[PDB]
Design a protein around this ligand. Structure first.
Ligand SMILES: *[C@@H]1O[C@H](CO)[C@@H](O)[C@H](O)[C@H]1NC(C)=O
Ligand SMILES: *[C@@H]1O[C@H](CO)[C@@H](O)[C@H](O)[C@H]1NC(C)=O
Ligand SMILES: *[C@@H]1O[C@H](CO)[C@@H](O)[C@H](O)[C@H]1NC(C)=O
Ligand SMILES: *[C@@H]1O[C@H](CO)[C@@H](O)[C@H](O)[C@H]1NC(C)=O
Length: 377
């Protein structure tokens, strides 16, 4: 009898749905109203050039300087479907196209080992545009789901998290009493955790990143990417990187992680600084989760490290690459080492050489490791 499993996805890592009754639109071809919720991520037909402005106008967040919190635009609601199920993390596109295949391979493996979707394997999707401080209801639901699974399946749960989901999970665990964790959590499997931030966030905020949707212009998509609090939350931290490391070079000025205030001024996005101040303290840099932890990190994949702009910030930069999994810098991934001596439960590090950030979820070596955690040797 295997332990129950909860899957926690990363940024862009689950479906999102929206419903509209807007006072105004950015152009005539945008819908003001929808009769039902529709899939806003991932739905390829919404990301065509004509209609991308409509999508941006609906999926952007509004930052309120007074409340220091985000809001949806007027007349837009966004929901997270499939909480407690797996469909919305298995496939990002409900057409089930391979372009959106995310947790599917892993869930198929779990089911082959005797798990049942929605029962002893459940997903914990969330609004990944936000940081954990504005996802309180999610954490309550997660705690309840874990307790339910413990009761139903007769033992403590294994959390398996990918990318930013790891930081969501750490935030959650840092806030639960040790006695609760000792009873209800069997282990935490961390895949590709950006503990110390990722360097590519600088380029995203400055000049946009359209690599996920290449037919769209980077300056257009930048509007949405800046609006997501999670982007500013994952700027490089000084517990991983040197305060003297230059992340952005231009012909006249450098930006290090001690220069974020100037950076946000200079790219014309002052709200980003406020978001960073709101979020930089959320995850305690050094406090370990207090559960058995398996830290899996990819290496040997060129990963954005720093950027040179000939023209700043409205032209794409030249990119300098360092080590990591293609998205998460190796330095960020390695914050676990420090936790080894700071908690009693074991912290196991596992290098995955040549394993790319998303591919690691469907990789046979990753799955073999998970099998050993769940089923024994
Ligand atoms: C910002 O929040 C304050 C207090 O909650 C509220 O008075 C105001 O309506 C908000 N501003 C916007 C533009 O929604
Ligand atoms: C590390 O980061 C924070 C600022 O957000 C601060 O508490 C601490 O003093 C910093 N240390 C530096 C810049 O050396
Ligand atoms: C910016 O970076 C370069 C090193 O790349 C350094 O010489 C220069 O002094 C830095 N800017 C400031 C204000 O120190
Ligand atoms: C899976 O990960 C291993 C290391 O863990 C890596 O060497 C291998 O190339 C990966 N598989 C694929 C298909 O890339």
């Amino acid at each position: 009898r295997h332990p129950p499993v909860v899957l926690v996805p990363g940024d862009l890592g689950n479906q999102l749905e929206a419903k509209l009754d807007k006072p105004t639109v950015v152009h005539y071809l945008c819908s003001k109203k929808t009769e039902s919720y529709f899939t806003i991520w991932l739905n390829l037909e919404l990301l065509l050039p004509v209609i991308i402005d409509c999508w941006i106008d609906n999926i952007r967040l509004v930052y309120n300087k007074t409340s220091r919190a985000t809001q949806f635009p007027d007349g837009v609601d966004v929901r997270v479907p499939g909480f407690g199920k797996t469909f919305s993390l298995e496939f990002l596109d409900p057409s089930k196209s391979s372009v959106g295949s995310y947790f599917h391979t892993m869930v198929e493996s779990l089911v082959g080992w005797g798990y049942t979707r929605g029962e002893d394997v459940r997903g914990a999707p969330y609004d990944w545009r936000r940081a954990p401080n504005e996802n309180g209801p999610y954490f309550l639901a997660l705690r309840e789901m874990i307790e339910e699974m413990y009761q139903l399946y007769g033992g403590p749960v294994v959390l398996v998290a990918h990318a930013m989901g790891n930081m969501y999970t750490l935030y959650f665990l840092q806030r639960q009493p040790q006695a609760w964790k000792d009873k209800y959590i069997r282990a935490f499997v961390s895949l590709g955790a950006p503990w110390g931030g990722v360097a590519k966030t600088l380029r995203v905020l400055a000049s946009g990143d359209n690599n996920r949707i290449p037919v769209i212009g980077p300056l257009k998509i930048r509007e949405q990417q800046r609006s997501a609090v999670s982007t500013s939350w994952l700027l490089p931290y000084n517990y991983t990187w040197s305060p003297e490391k230059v992340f952005v070079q231009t012909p006249t000025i450098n930006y290090t992680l001690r220069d974020y205030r100037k950076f946000f001024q200079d790219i014309g996005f002052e709200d980003g600084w406020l978001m960073r101040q709101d979020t930089e303290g959320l995850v305690e840099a050094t406090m370990p989760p207090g559960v058995q932890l398996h830290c899996l990190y990819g290496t040997g994949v060129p990963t954005p490290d720093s950027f040179y702009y000939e023209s700043f910030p409205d032209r794409d930069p030249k990119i300098c690459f360092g080590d990591g999994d293609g998205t998460v810098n190796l330095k960020s991934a390695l914050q676990c080492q420090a936790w080894q001596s700071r908690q009693e439960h074991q912290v196991l590090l596992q290098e995955l050489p040549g394993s790319e950030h998303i591919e690691m979820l469907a990789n046979a070596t990753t799955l073999a490791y998970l099998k050993r955690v769940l089923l024994g040797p």
